[PDB]
């Protein structure tokens, strides 16, 4: 029981509109059938073109919404609808396009998934709220088979050439007219009550209906993000490593350990408050500070209200020392803070778009990140980037130019000269740093923080 039984039910009552006369009663088996992709034999790797909202959460990052309305049934024009924000038109002689044939339709559609899909994913699944034109438009740009290898590289192929009869994955793609077997699941599955935009707007506020088919494809997406990531969450789903993810998190744990080590070489706190991830272990394992941790998983669909997590009665003073909130999203964080908080506005390929705002960071693991509020940080500022260091000034061991910083917080920079061993040390502190933040953490702090207190650390 891993993938969808071709001969499990499929519930027609949604397609009757487009489809009337539809049979109540519908295998994936019959409704494959229907669309044209009838097949003799079994494909390995390939047994249903639907797959299981299991098989579906494994593959969020191929995740495309799509809608198909009738623009005007082989008569009338349709128009295409993806959550990429593409509209296209298709004639059987926010982005809208005007009416063409199914031949450059389809060439279209190729190069678009191509783009979006070849940093992210191996494949394209498909999210339906199906109502029939959806799934008789995919014979006009679909082809099947057995699962294949990219004519160019070692990955499965996901297009298809009828100009040249090859096969391509996304990156190797140019030119391809269909594409191959594609993966779908249709929302309305689930369970239900009502139409589309009634069930997405219950969840969600930023995504509108301006009654065109992208904005039918993103609220479908939308709605399946919530359901599988907001309302139920899994954290024991890993994800393929596909860009940065090793060396962002790696940077996380050396900008963590720096960040609170220093704030606490400054200020001194005779308590460290560490509200979080109840797996958390001592960033600064060799600190004096009394270290005291609350447990709070990541919020996944609203901020925590800073109320809920302190009040209704632990060391209950949460206003003694310090509190470290390192991916603890909350609303309003209290003004003795040292808080990471993930952008969620980030441009990256790890962080896909989510519901209500929020977005869908994917690294090892999927984390439905409500979104980001500047309001929550009034009560601290940012925190500038410095390098602090109290290791020896010792080489032992990459070429050198000399480093000249008034952020190399070190013995070296004091006495007047960057030692090599910390101006090495810094500028691959300043990577991982830039690593980070361009990944879409921002690091905030309480407004005594000043790097001129870690300057007498060295005496
Ligand atoms: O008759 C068919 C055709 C296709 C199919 O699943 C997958 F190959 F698309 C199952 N049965
Ligand atoms: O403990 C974690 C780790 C990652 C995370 O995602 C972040 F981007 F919002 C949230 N909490
Ligand atoms: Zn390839
Ligand atoms: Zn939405
Ligand atoms: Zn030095």
Redesign the pocket.
């Known amino acids: 029981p891993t993938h969808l039984s071709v001969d499990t039910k499929f519930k027609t009552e949604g397609l009757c509109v487009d489809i009337p006369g539809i049979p109540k009663d519908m295998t994936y088996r019959r409704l494959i059938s229907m669309m044209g992709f009838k097949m003799n034999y079994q494909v390995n790797g390939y047994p249903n073109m639907f797959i299981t909202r299991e098989e579906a959460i494994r593959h969020v990052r191929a995740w495309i919404g799509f809608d198909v309305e009738g623009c005007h049934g082989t008569n009338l024009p349709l128009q295409l609808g993806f959550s990429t924000g593409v509209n296209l038109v298709a004639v059987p002689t926010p982005l809208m396009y005007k009416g063409l044939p199914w031949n450059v339709v389809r060439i279209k559609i190729v190069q678009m998934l191509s783009d979006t899909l070849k940093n992210l994913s191996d494949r394209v699944v498909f999210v339906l709220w199906a109502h029939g034109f959806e799934l008789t438009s995919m014979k006009y740009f679909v082809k099947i088979g057995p699962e294949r290898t990219c004519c160019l590289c070692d990955r499965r192929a996901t297009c298809f050439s009828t100009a040249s009869d090859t096969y391509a994955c996304w990156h190797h793609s140019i030119g391809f007219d269909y594409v191959y077997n594609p993966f779908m699941i249709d929302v309305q599955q689930w369970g239900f009550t009502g139409n589309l935009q009634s069930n997405h707007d219950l969840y969600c506020q930023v995504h509108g209906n301006a009654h065109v088919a992208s904005c039918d494809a993103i609220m479908t997406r939308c709605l399946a993000v919530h359901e599988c990531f907001v309302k139920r969450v899994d954290w024991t789903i890993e994800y393929p490593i596909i860009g940065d993810e090793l060396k962002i998190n790696a940077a996380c744990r050396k900008v963590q350990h720096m960040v609170v080590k220093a704030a606490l070489l400054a200020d001194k706190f005779p308590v460290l408050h560490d509200i979080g991830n109840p797996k958390a272990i001592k960033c600064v394992p060799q600190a004096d500070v009394e270290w005291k941790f609350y447990d709070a998983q990541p919020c996944s669909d609203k901020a925590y209200k800073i109320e809920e997590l302190f009040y209704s009665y632990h060391s209950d003073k949460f206003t003694d020392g310090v509190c470290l909130f390192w991916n603890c999203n909350v609303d309003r964080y209290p003004a003795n803070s040292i808080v990471c908080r993930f952008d969620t506005r980030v441009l990256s390929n790890l962080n896909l778009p989510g519901c209500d705002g929020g977005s869908l960071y994917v690294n090892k693991h999927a984390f439905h990140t409500p979104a980001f509020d500047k309001s929550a940080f009034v009560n601290l500022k940012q925190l500038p980037f410095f390098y602090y ?1 109290d ?4 080489s032992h061991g990459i070429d050198y130019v000399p480093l000249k910083s008034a952020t190399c917080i ?4 004091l006495g007047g000269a ?6 090495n040390e810094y500028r691959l502190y300043l990577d991982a740093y830039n690593m980070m933040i361009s990944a879409g953490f921002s690091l905030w702090v309480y407004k005594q923080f000043d790097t001129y207190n870690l300057w007498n650390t060295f005496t």
């Open positions: 260091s290791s020896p000034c010792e070190t013995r070296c920079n960057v030692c090599r061993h910390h101006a």
